[PDB]
Amino acid sequence: MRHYDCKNYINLDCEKGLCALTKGMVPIDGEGSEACPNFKPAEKCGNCKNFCNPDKYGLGTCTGLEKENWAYATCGASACPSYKAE
Amino acid sequence: DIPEAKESTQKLMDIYYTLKVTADMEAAYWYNRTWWENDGEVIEVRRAKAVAASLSHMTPTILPYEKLVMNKTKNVRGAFPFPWVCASFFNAQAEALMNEVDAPAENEADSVSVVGAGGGNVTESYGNVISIAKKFGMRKEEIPVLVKTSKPWEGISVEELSNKYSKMTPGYDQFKNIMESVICMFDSFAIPQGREVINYYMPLQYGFDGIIKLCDEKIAEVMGEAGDDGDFGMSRGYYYAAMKEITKGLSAWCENYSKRAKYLASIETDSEIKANYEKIEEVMGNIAHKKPANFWEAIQMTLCCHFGVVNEDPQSGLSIGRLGQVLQPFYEKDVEDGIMTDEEVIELLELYRIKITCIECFASAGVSGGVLSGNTFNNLSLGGQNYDGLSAVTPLEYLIVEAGMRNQTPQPTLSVLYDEKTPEDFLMKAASCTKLGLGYPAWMNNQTGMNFMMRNYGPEGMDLHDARAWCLGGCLESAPGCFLPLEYNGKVTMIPGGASPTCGTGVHFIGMPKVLELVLTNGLDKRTGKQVYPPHNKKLDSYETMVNQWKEYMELTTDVVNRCNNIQMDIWRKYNMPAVNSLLKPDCFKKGKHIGTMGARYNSCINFESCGTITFVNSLSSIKKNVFDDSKFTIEEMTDAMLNNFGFKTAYETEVFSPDFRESTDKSTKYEKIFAACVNAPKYGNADKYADEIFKAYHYYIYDMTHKFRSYYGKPLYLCQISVSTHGPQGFVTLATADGRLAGTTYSDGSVSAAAGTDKNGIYAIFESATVYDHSMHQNAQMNLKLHPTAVKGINGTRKLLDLVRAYMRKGGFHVQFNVVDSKTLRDAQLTPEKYRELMVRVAGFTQYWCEIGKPIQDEVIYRTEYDK
Ligand SMILES: O=C(O)Cc1ccc(O)cc1
Numbered sequence: 001m002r003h004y005d006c007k008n009y010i011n012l013d014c015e016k017g018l019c020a021l022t023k024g025m026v027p028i029d030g031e032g033s034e035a036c037p038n039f040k041p042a043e044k045c046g047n048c049k050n051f052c053n054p055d056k057y058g059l060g061t062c063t064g065l066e067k068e069n070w071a072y073a074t075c076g077a078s079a080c081p082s083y084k085a086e
Numbered sequence: 087d088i089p090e091a092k093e094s095t096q097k098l099m100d101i102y103y104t105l106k107v108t109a110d111m112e113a114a115y116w117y118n119r120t121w122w123e124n125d126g127e128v129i130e131v132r133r134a135k136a137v138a139a140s141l142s143h144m145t146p147t148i149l150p151y152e153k154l155v156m157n158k159t160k161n162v163r164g165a166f167p168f169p170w171v172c173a174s175f176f177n178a179q180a181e182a183l184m185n186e187v188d189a190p191a192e193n194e195a196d197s198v199s200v201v202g203a204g205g206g207n208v209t210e211s212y213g214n215v216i217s218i219a220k221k222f223g224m225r226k227e228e229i230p231v232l233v234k235t236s237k238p239w240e241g242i243s244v245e246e247l248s249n250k251y252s253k254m255t256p257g258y259d260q261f262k263n264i265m266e267s268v269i270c271m272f273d274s275f276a277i278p279q280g281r282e283v284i285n286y287y288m289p290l291q292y293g294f295d296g297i298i299k300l301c302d303e304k305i306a307e308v309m310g311e312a313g314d315d316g317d318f319g320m321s322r323g324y325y326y327a328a329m330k331e332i333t334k335g336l337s338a339w340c341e342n343y344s345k346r347a348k349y350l351a352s353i354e355t356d357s358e359i360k361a362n363y364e365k366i367e368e369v370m371g372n373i374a375h376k377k378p379a380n381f382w383e384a385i386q387m388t389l390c391c392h393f394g395v396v397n398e399d400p401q402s403g404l405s406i407g408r409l410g411q412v413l414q415p416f417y418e419k420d421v422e423d424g425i426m427t428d429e430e431v432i433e434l435l436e437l438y439r440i441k442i443t444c445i446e447c448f449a450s451a452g453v454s455g456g457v458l459s460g461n462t463f464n465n466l467s468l469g470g471q472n473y474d475g476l477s478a479v480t481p482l483e484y485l486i487v488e489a490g491m492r493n494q495t496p497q498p499t500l501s502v503l504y505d506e507k508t509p510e511d512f513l514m515k516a517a518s519c520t521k522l523g524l525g526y527p528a529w530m531n532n533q534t535g536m537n538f539m540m541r542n543y544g545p546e547g548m549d550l551h552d553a554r555a556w557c558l559g560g561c562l563e564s565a566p567g568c569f570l571p572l573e574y575n576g577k578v579t580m581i582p583g584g585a586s587p588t589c590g591t592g593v594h595f596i597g598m599p600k601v602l603e604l605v606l607t608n609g610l611d612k613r614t615g616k617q618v619y620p621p622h623n624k625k626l627d628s629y630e631t632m633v634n635q636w637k638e639y640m641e642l643t644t645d646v647v648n649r650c651n652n653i654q655m656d657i658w659r660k661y662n663m664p665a666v667n668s669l670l671k672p673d674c675f676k677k678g679k680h681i682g683t684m685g686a687r688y689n690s691c692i693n694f695e696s697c698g699t700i701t702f703v704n705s706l707s708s709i710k711k712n713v714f715d716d717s718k719f720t721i722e723e724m725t726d727a728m729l730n731n732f733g734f735k736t737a738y739e740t741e742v743f744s745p746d747f748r749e750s751t752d753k754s755t756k757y758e759k760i761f762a763a764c765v766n767a768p769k770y771g772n773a774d775k776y777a778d779e780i781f782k783a784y785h786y787y788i789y790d791m792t793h794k795f796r797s798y799y800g801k802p803l804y805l806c807q808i809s810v811s812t813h814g815p816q817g818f819v820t821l822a823t824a825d826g827r828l829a830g831t832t833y834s835d836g837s838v839s840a841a842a843g844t845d846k847n848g849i850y851a852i853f854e855s856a857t858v859y860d861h862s863m864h865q866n867a868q869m870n871l872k873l874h875p876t877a878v879k880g881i882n883g884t885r886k887l888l889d890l891v892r893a894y895m896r897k898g899g900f901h902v903q904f905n906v907v908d909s910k911t912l913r914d915a916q917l918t919p920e921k922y923r924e925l926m927v928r929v930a931g932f933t934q935y936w937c938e939i940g941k942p943i944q945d946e947v948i949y950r951t952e953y954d955k
Pocket residue numbers: 280281402403404457458462463559560561562590591594595695810931
C-alpha cells in the first residue's frame with residue numbers, strides 16, 4: 001500500500017497529502033509513496049464487504065442496499081453508513 | 087507595526103502555498119447516486135436528500151494545527167463537478183481521454199480566457215493528474231468516475247435541457263451567435279447561486295436539532311393542507327420535509343468531522359496538536375445538534391452553512407456578509423466570561439481567512455479564468471447602520487480588520503459600508519489596512535446602497551429596516567438583507583443576513599465595445615468572419631444614427647439572452663432548487679416556499695451586466711469628435727483604422743494586453759494622424775463635459791433599457807456594472823476601438839475607473855466625472871485607483887487615504903478600491919513569478935496572488951495609472 005491507502009493520511013491535493021503521524025508531506029505516486037509499518041487501512045469502497053465486481057478502472061458494484069448500484073474503489077468510505085470492513 | 091500571524095496560521099499557510107487546486111468526485115458521485123436512487127420522489131425532497139448525501143458521505147479532512155475545520159471536499163483547495171447543472175466544458179474532454187484520442191478544442195469563451203499558470207492552478211496535465219478546464223487537477227483514476235457520473239445527465243442537465251427550450255425561442259440563432267462571439271461572456275446556468283449574501287440566522291438561533299423539531303412541527307401542522315392557496319399551499323409540506331432532510335444532512339456532516347477529529351486525537355503523540363483535535367471533536371460534535379454556545383462554535387457553524395451552500399451548486403460570490411455583527415453576541419460573551427481573550431479571537435479570525443481563501447469554484451475556464459481569476463468572492467462586509475439606524479460597527483469588526491492585517495490572504499475581501507455615522511477610529515483602522523496594498527478593505531457607499539435598495543425593491547415592500555441590512559453580494563452586487571432576532575446570552579440582537587436569491591444572474595457581461603464594433607462593421611464580426619447580427623445596412627450618416635443602431639443591437643442582444651437565461655435559471659429552480667440555502671434564506675422557512683418558488687423576501691434580484699463601459703463611452707467620444715462634429719475623418723476612415731489596428735501589431739501576436747507596449751509596424755504612420763486624434767479626443771474621467779455628457783446619457787438610457795425586460799421571477803431587470811476579470815476576454819475578442827485602445831487588449835477595468843493612461847487631471851477629476859449621475863439608479867459602480875506606496879506614508883498617509891475615500895463617498899460615489907503598489911514591482915513579478923509566490927494585487931472586486939492571474943489582467947493591472955500624491 002501507499003500513504004494514500006492509509007487511515008493516517010491527511011488529504012491535501014491531487015499530488016500529495018500529510019502523514020498524520022510524522023506531519024510531513026507525502027506523495028501519492030512514485031518514489032516515497034509506499035506504506036510504512038505503522039500503516040492502518042483507510043476505509044474505502046475498494047475495501048468494503050459490500051463492494052464487488054470492479055472493472056479495470058476500479059468501478060464496480062455496491063450491494064450495501066437491496067437495490068445494487070455502482071461505486072468506485074478509491075471512494076472514501078469512512079462516512080458511508082453501510083460500510084463494512086471486508 | 088503589524089503583529090506576526092499566529093503559529094498555527096503560519097504553519098497552515100506554509101502548507102497552503104504548496105497546494106494544488108484539485109477536482110475530485112466524492113460529492114458528485116454521492117449526489118448522483120442518491121438522486122437516481124430516489125427517482126420518483128417529490129422534487130424538493132429528492133433534491134434535499136441528494137445534496138444531504140453529497141455532503142454527509144464525503145471524506146472529512148482535518149489538518150494538524152487547525153482550530154477551525156471543514157473544506158468543500160476531502161482536498162484543501164477542493165471542488166467537484168456538477169454534471170446535472172453543466173458538463174459540456176469537461177465531458178468531451180473526459181471521453182476523449184477514455185478513448186485515448188485527442189481532446190477536442192475548447193469553445194470560444196473558454197479559449198479566449200486565461201487561467202494563471204502559477205500558484206495552485208493545474209493548467210496542464212502532468213504525471214497522474216489531468217488538468218480539467220485548464221485549472222483543476224483531477225487524479226487520472228477518477229476520470230472514469232467522472233465519465234460514469236456524468237453520463238446519466240445527457241440531454242437533461244440544466245445546460246442541455248434549457249438548451250432544448252432555448253432552441254424554441256425565436257431568437258435562438260441570434261443568441262447562439264452572441265455567445266460564440268463572446269459578446270455575452272457566459273450562461274447563467276454556470277453559477278446559478280452566488281453574488282448574494284448568505285444568512286446564518288437559523289442554525290445560529292436554533293441549532294440543527296432545533297431546526298429538525300421546527301420541521302416536525304410544521305409538517306404536523308400543514309402536510310396535506312393547502313389553506314386557501316391552491317398554487318403553493320400543498321407544497322409547504324414537501325418544503326418542510328425537504329428541510330428536515332437537508333438539516334439531517336448538515337448534522338451528519340458535522341458528526342463526520344467530529345469522528346475524524348476523535349480519530350486524529352487518538353493517534354496524536356504531540357499533546358499540543360492533540361488538544362486542538364479534542365476541541366474540534368467537541369466543537370463539531372456540538373454544532374451537529376445544539377445551538378452554538380461560544381464563539382468558536384458559532385463561527386464554526388457559519389462555516390458549516392457557508393460550505394454547505396457552496397457545495398450545493400457551482401457558484402462564486404456567496405458573500406459571508408456582516409460576520410462581525412452576526413457574531414458580536416457570541417464574541418462578547420466569550421470575552422466577558424473570560425472564555426476567550428481577544429488574541430485567541432484574532433487567531434480564529436486569522437485561521438478563518440485561510441478557510442475562506444481555499445474556497446474554489448469548479449466551472450468552465452471562461453468563468454474561472456475569464457471572469458473570476460480563480461477568486462470566489464466570499465465578501466465580508468463591515469459597519470453601515472444597524473436595525474435601529476445607528477452605527478453598526480462592533481468591537482468584533484476591529485478584530486476582523488486586525489486578522490486581515492496579520493494574516494494577509496486574498497479572502498475574505500473586506501468591505502466597509504462607509505457611513506457618516508461610523509466611528510473615526512474604525513474608519514482609520516480600516517484605512518490603515520487598505521493602505522497596505524492588499525486591496526482590502528474596499529469602500530462602498532452605505533447610503534447609496536440603501537438608496538438602490540429602496541428604489542429597486544420598493545415594489546416588494548423594502549423598508550428602511552431591511553435596507554439597512556443590505557451589503558455586497560459577491561464583489562459589488564448590492565444584495566437585499568434583513569435583520570432577525572437572535573436570542574443569546576439573555577438578550578436579543580437583530581443580526582443581519584441576506585434576504586434575496588442571486589443578484590448577479592440574468593443577462594451576463596455584454597461587451598459593449600464589441601457591440602459598437604459590430605454597428606460599424608454592419609453586424610459582421612471581423613475577428614472571426616461570422617455574421618453575428620442581422621446587417622442593419624444603414625449609412626452611418628450621423629452620431630445619432632450610429633448610437634441608435636448601437637441601442638438597437640443592445641436591445642436585441644438583451645432580449646434574446648434574457649429569454650434564454652430565464653429558461654436556464656427556471657429549469658434550475660424547478661429541477662434543481664436550493665436545499666441548504668432554502669433552509670437558511672428568509673422568508674423560505676416562514677412561508678414554506680424554497681428559493682425557487684420565491685420563498686426569499688426579495689426576488690427582484692435578476693439583472694443585466696455591462697462590460698467595457700469606459701472603453702465604450704471613450705470610443706463614442708472619439709467618433710463624435712473626429713467623425714461627426716469636427717468631420718476631420720470619415721466613418722469609413724475610422725472603421726478601417728480600427729480594423730487595421732491603427733497599423734500596430736495585435737495582441738494576438740505580441741501578447742501584450744495593454745497600451746503598455748505596441749510593436750509599431752510600418753503601417754502605423756499610415757494611421758498615425760487618426761490614431762493620435764483618437765487618443766486625443768475627450769476622455770471620460772477628466773471632468774471633461776464632452777466625454778462626461780455621453781457617459782451621463784449612457785446611464786439614463788441603460789437604466790431605461792434594462793427595466794423593460796423581465797426576469798423569470800417576473801421582475802424588471804436593472805444594471806449591474808462591474809468588470810471582475812471579464813475585460814480580459816471581452817477585450818480579447820474586440821478589435822481596436824475608436825478611443826485608441828488596441829486589438830485584443832483589455833477593456834477598461836471596472837465601470838467608473840478612467841481608461842488606463844487617460845486620466846490626466848488628477849483623481850478628483852475622476853470623482854467629478856463618475857458622479858455626473860446618481861449612483862443609486864443602478865446596483866453599483868466600480869472604481870479602481872492605484873497609489874504609489876510613497877503616496878500614503880505615515881499615519882498622515884492613512885488619514886489622507888481616508889479623506890480621499892470620504893471625498894468620493896460624499897459626492898455620492900458608490901465604491902472605490904485601491905492598489906498601493908509600485909507598478910515596476912508588478913512588471914518584475916511578471917518576468918519571474920517564481921520569485922513572488924505571496925505577492926497579491928487588487929484586480930476588480932477581488933485580491934489574488936499574482937502568480938495565479940493571467941497575463942492579460944496582469945498587464946492590465948500593471949498599466950493602471952499610478953498616483954504619486
Ligand atoms: O462572484 C463574484 O462576485 C464574481 C462574479 C460577479 C458577477 C458574475 O456574473 C460572475 C462572477
